[PDB]
Amino acid sequence: FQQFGRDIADTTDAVRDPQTLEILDITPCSFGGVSVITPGTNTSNQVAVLYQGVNCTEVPVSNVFQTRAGCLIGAEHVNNSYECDIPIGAGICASYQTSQSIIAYTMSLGAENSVAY
Amino acid sequence: SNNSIAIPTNFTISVTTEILPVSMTKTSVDCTMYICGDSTECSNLLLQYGSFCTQLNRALTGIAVEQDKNTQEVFAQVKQIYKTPPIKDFGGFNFSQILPDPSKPSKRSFIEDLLFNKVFNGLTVLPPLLTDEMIAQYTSALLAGTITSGWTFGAGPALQIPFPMQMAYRFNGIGVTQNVLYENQKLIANQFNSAIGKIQDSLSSTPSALGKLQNVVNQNAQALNTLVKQLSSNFGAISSVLNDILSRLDPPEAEVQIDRLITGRLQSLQTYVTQQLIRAAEIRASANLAATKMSECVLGQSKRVDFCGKGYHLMSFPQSAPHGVVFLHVTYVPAQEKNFTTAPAICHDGKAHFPREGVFVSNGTHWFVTQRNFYEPQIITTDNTFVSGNCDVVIGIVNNTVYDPLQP
Amino acid sequence: FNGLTVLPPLLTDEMIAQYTSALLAGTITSGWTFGAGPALQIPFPMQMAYRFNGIGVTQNVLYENQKLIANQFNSAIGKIQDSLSSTPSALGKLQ
Amino acid sequence: SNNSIAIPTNFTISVTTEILPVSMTKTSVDCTMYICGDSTECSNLLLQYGSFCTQLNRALTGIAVEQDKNTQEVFAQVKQIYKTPPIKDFGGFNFSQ
Amino acid sequence: GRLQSLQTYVTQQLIRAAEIRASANLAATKMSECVLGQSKRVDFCGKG
Numbered sequence: 001f002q003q004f005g006r007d008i009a010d011t012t013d014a015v016r017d018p019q020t021l022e023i024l025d026i027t028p029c030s031f032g033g034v035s036v037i038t039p040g041t042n043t044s045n046q047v048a049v050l051y052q053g054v055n056c057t058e059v060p061v062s063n064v065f066q067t068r069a070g071c072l073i074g075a076e077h078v079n080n081s082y083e084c085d086i087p088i089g090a091g092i093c094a095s096y097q098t099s100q101s102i103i104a105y106t107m108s109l110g111a112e113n114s115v116a117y
Numbered sequence: 118s119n120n121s122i123a124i125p126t127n128f129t130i131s132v133t134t135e136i137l138p139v140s141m142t143k144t145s146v147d148c149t150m151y152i153c154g155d156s157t158e159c160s161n162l163l164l165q166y167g168s169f170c171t172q173l174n175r176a177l178t179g180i181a182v183e184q185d186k187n188t189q190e191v192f193a194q195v196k197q198i199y200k201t202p203p204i205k206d207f208g209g210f211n212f213s214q215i216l217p218d219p220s221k222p223s224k225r226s227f228i229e230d231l232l233f234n235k236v237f238n239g240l241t242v243l244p245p246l247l248t249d250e251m252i253a254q255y256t257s258a259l260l261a262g263t264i265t266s267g268w269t270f271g272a273g274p275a276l277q278i279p280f281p282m283q284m285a286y287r288f289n290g291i292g293v294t295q296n297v298l299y300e301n302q303k304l305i306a307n308q309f310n311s312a313i314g315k316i317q318d319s320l321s322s323t324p325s326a327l328g329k330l331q332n333v334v335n336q337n338a339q340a341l342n343t344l345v346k347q348l349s350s351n352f353g354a355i356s357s358v359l360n361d362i363l364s365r366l367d368p369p370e371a372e373v374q375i376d377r378l379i380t381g382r383l384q385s386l387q388t389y390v391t392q393q394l395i396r397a398a399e400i401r402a403s404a405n406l407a408a409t410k411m412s413e414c415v416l417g418q419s420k421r422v423d424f425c426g427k428g429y430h431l432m433s434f435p436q437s438a439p440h441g442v443v444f445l446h447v448t449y450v451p452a453q454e455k456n457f458t459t460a461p462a463i464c465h466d467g468k469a470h471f472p473r474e475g476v477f478v479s480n481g482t483h484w485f486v487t488q489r490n491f492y493e494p495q496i497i498t499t500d501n502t503f504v505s506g507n508c509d510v511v512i513g514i515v516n517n518t519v520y521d522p523l524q525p
Numbered sequence: 526f527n528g529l530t531v532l533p534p535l536l537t538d539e540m541i542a543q544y545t546s547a548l549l550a551g552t553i554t555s556g557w558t559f560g561a562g563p564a565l566q567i568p569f570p571m572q573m574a575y576r577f578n579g580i581g582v583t584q585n586v587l588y589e590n591q592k593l594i595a596n597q598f599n600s601a602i603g604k605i606q607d608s609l610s611s612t613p614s615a616l617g618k619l620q
Numbered sequence: 621s622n623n624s625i626a627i628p629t630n631f632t633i634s635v636t637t638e639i640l641p642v643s644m645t646k647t648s649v650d651c652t653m654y655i656c657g658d659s660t661e662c663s664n665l666l667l668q669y670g671s672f673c674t675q676l677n678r679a680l681t682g683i684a685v686e687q688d689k690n691t692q693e694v695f696a697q698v699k700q701i702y703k704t705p706p707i708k709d710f711g712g713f714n715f716s717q
Numbered sequence: 718g719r720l721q722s723l724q725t726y727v728t729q730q731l732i733r734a735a736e737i738r739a740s741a742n743l744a745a746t747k748m749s750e751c752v753l754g755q756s757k758r759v760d761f762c763g764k765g
């Protein structure tokens with residue numbers, strides 16, 4: 001006898017199609033913020049873009065990378081680790097490294113040391 | 118009484134815990150989307166209120182950046198990443214409960230695992246810049262530096278030293294002689310291990326130990342829930358949903374009802390942002406305190422009373438926790454005191470003798486000079502006493518005899 | 526009252542006085558000890574000698590000048606009472 | 621000058637005072653009764669404003685609990701209640717004040 | 718109007734309570750360090 005579902009905050013999250021009785025789920029349309037990553041116009045005019053909390057496929061359509069923060073566009077993901085220059089988030093940092101381009105990597109917390117004990 | 122003094126004869130190594138929150142969740146509520154998401158007439162009326170939808174976003178962005186700075190300033194206090202040696206013979210002390218456990222995929226310690234286990238209408242939640250793995254890496258580096266180096270790794274180049282000698286230095290810093298450690302090494306190691314085990318058991322048993330972190334999480338969740346619930350209210354208009362406002366009414370009445378809804382929702386958003394600012398200020402104060410304790414208790418040995426624990430501070434160990442830090446303070450407490458009869462000075466040959474470092478005590482028949490925090494009596498000698506004046510000015514001087522080593 | 530009410534404090538002023546009396550008694554009779562473990566007794570003259578020993582002054586300074594130091598301390602306490610009783614704007618923060 | 625020093629020959633025992641507030645008065649203003657004590661239409665109209673009357677009470681209650689915690693953490697710092705001996709000969713020092 | 722007045726009062730009380738909490742934390746610290754021990758921090762427990 002139940003037609004629609006409401007959650008803990010009283011927002012409808014499910015409906016039963018009236019003609020074929022199949023339970024369906026309502027998930028909000030993607031929304032978020034857009035951020036621009038720049039190394040400063042004093043050095044270059046090449047920027048990267050970050051779409052926060054959005055899957056790369058849903059972005060309307062250089063190099064596309066998915067991170068926990070969101071979809072990064074225009075930055076090449078290296079496999080190394082350096083000190084954080086520009087903090088993107090979730091352990092991901094961006095920098096301007098040599099031709100010459102904007103790279104995205106994972107943070108390095110510092111040099112590895114071992115005291116001779 | 119004016120001649121009785123109590124001196125301890127035994128000690129106890131105790132470990133206490135302290136929990137401090139350092140950061141909170143980074144939420145962000147979009148202004149226009151919350152007040153009215155799909156409507157365009159509502160947006161056009163909302164533009165008439167100027168920049169009430171930029172100040173709120175600016176405030177929330179400032180709060181999020183503040184949270185990241187809080188975590189950064191608390192945990193990132195080590196320049197390098199130190200590692201403990203594979204051989205782990207620290208003279209009897211057993212740091213297994215706090216050192217990282219490589220078997221687990223998360224590489225967290227026993228106590229850290231226990232701690233972590235125990236604990237849209239236009240709104241988004243950002244992820245923290247430092248993942249929990251990096252927080253654990255900081256805490257592990259701090260622990261390895263403390264165990265291997267001492268306090269030297271926080272004031273320059275890290276210098277190795279055997280842990281027994283480091284404990285001897287740390288006793289020497291509270292007024293107890295080095296020889297106390299070396300003659301009771303096994304007993305102290307056993308007490309430390311038992312205390313660490315008891316800390317683990319006490320944390321695991323009682324669930325209401327981590328009150329502050331849960332309190333912060335609950336407060337934030339309740340605030341967000343109240344905002345979402347407040348989204349559906351009339352505020353004097355005919356209906357809360359604005360589709361019925363815009364479909365069943367002519368432009369004038371629809372406009373006035375939309376204005377009423379807009380005013381109510383804007384007031385609610387302002388209230389939420391103000392309370393968030395106050396809460397963020399409180400959390401920043403707590404994070405400043407946590408950073409100070411990390412600097413002074415972990416990287417050094419503080420003489421401030423009741424700052425790093427309850428007793429005479431020996432050292433401290435940091436552990437991570439969801440949105441917070443946990444300090445394990447290892448302290449020294451005396452026990453098994455005994456009464457003694459004491460005198461200010463001693464008149465040997467018409468000259469008053471005072472102790473260099475210690476105090477005069479008595480079985481009841483003989484006189485000895487001892488420490489102040491431990492009972493280690495020894496014969497009175499010219500080596501450990503100094504002369505000043507005659508035997509007439511001191512009130513309470515006691516006639517007795519001293520010994521001179523230059524009499525073989 | 527138009528709907529406004531004032532709740533009483535959980536601790537009465539007598540209990541606060543009892544706390545402060547316990548603190549004073551422990552400080553006078555024990556010294557540092559009662560705040561870092563089991564309380565241990567010590568004569569007050571030797572406690573003051575220990576406290577001079579902590580600021581860089583040798584113990585014999587206190588013992589040879591005990592009467593002068595006691596008189597200075599008593600005079601200072603009396604002057605504190607006189608000064609507090611003199612000006613009514615001393616307690617500006619609580620007011 | 622590069623060879624002269626100044627050294628004291630006497631001392632003074634000085635007592636100073638410092639005053640610090642630790643708590644305020646615990647008040648709790650009722651929301652609806654302040655706005656309108658007896659009117660019923662007023663209460664019915666206020667019910668359309670949602671939870672603007674529970675947040676205020678929650679905040680004030682939090683403040684009162686905080687005041688009690690402030691006093692408790694400032695003063696309650698001894699596990700036992702110590703007592704001074706009936707004989708009060710402390711070597712010349714007078715604590716009767 | 719009356720709701721606005723109540724909101725203003727509550728906000729001011731919250732800020733004042735934060736200030737008093739800071740002062741009470743300072744008082745607790747001074748009780749721990751000056752009364753229960755002897756402090757080497759300059760100008761903390763008096764002047765001298």
Ligand SMILES: *[C@@H]1O[C@H](CO)[C@@H](O[C@@H]2O[C@H](CO)[C@@H](O)[C@H](O)[C@H]2NC(C)=O)[C@H](O)[C@H]1NC(C)=O
Pocket residue numbers: 018019020
């Ligand atoms: C509403 O009409 C649809 C279409 O006729 C019905 O769907 C059919 O239901 C029968 C009975 O189970 C199935 O055998 C058919 O395969 C269904 N058609 C399709 C295209 O899937 C539906 O059952 C009707 N529902 C009600 C409540 O009347």
Ligand SMILES: *[C@@H]1O[C@H](CO)[C@@H](O[C@@H]2O[C@H](CO)[C@@H](O)[C@H](O)[C@H]2NC(C)=O)[C@H](O)[C@H]1NC(C)=O
Pocket residue numbers: 126127128129304307308
């Ligand atoms: C100081 O206290 C410790 C306990 O905290 C004493 O060690 C205990 O001694 C008893 C009696 O031999 C044993 O049954 C316990 O197993 C010991 N405990 C530990 C942890 O070793 C110690 O003897 C005391 N010191 C002195 C001088 O008596």
Ligand SMILES: *[C@@H]1O[C@H](CO)[C@@H](O[C@@H]2O[C@H](CO)[C@@H](O)[C@H](O)[C@H]2NC(C)=O)[C@H](O)[C@H]1NC(C)=O
Pocket residue numbers: 211212213
């Ligand atoms: C340090 O303490 C831990 C915990 O008490 C010891 O680990 C135990 O080791 C025994 C034998 O290897 C096992 O049966 C237990 O299950 C272990 N306990 C835990 C919690 O893992 C460890 O052996 C101690 N270190 C040393 C050097 O003895």
Ligand SMILES: *[C@@H]1O[C@H](CO)[C@@H](O[C@@H]2O[C@H](CO)[C@@H](O)[C@H](O)[C@H]2NC(C)=O)[C@H](O)[C@H]1NC(C)=O
Pocket residue numbers: 480481482483
């Ligand atoms: C006073 O101190 C002395 C020194 O320790 C104690 O005398 C010793 O007592 C033990 C136990 O009988 C003997 O083995 C030693 O030979 C004694 N030493 C000397 C130099 O006589 C004496 O017990 C203490 N007084 C009291 C009341 O305990």
Ligand SMILES: *[C@@H]1O[C@H](CO)[C@@H](O[C@@H]2O[C@H](CO)[C@@H](O)[C@H](O)[C@H]2NC(C)=O)[C@H](O)[C@H]1NC(C)=O
Pocket residue numbers: 593596597629630631
């Ligand atoms: C140190 O200062 C004290 C106090 O100022 C001096 O004691 C005073 O001495 C004068 C001279 O005899 C007396 O008139 C006062 O009554 C004394 N005051 C007290 C409180 O006793 C003391 O003489 C000074 N010592 C030196 C070496 O200058």
Ligand SMILES: *[C@@H]1O[C@H](CO)[C@@H](O[C@@H]2O[C@H](CO)[C@@H](O)[C@H](O)[C@H]2NC(C)=O)[C@H](O)[C@H]1NC(C)=O
Pocket residue numbers: 714715716717
């Ligand atoms: C400590 O000081 C107080 C006050 O300075 C002394 O109390 C005075 O005692 C005399 C002696 O009879 C009385 O004449 C005064 O009226 C008392 N004053 C007050 C304010 O009560 C007290 O005697 C001093 N302590 C000692 C041991 O003498």
Ligand SMILES: *[C@@H]1O[C@H](CO)[C@@H](O)[C@H](O)[C@H]1NC(C)=O
Pocket residue numbers: 079
């Ligand atoms: C970077 O790492 C990924 C993960 O294995 C690997 O597939 C890729 O080939 C690596 N690229 C380089 C240039 O090493």
Ligand SMILES: *[C@@H]1O[C@H](CO)[C@@H](O)[C@H](O)[C@H]1NC(C)=O
Pocket residue numbers: 454455456
């Ligand atoms: C020291 O002597 C007092 C005298 O009454 C006594 O109460 C106390 O218990 C004695 N100390 C110990 C450790 O027994």
Ligand SMILES: *[C@@H]1O[C@H](CO)[C@@H](O)[C@H](O)[C@H]1NC(C)=O
Pocket residue numbers: 119120512513514
């Ligand atoms: C201790 O006080 C008593 C009086 O109770 C006195 O007879 C004795 O001389 C005093 N001793 C010292 C060392 O002050």
Ligand SMILES: *[C@@H]1O[C@H](CO)[C@@H](O)[C@H](O)[C@H]1NC(C)=O
Pocket residue numbers: 464516517
């Ligand atoms: C100690 O020596 C002084 C001076 O020689 C003397 O007056 C005093 O009586 C002696 N002590 C004892 C206990 O006899």
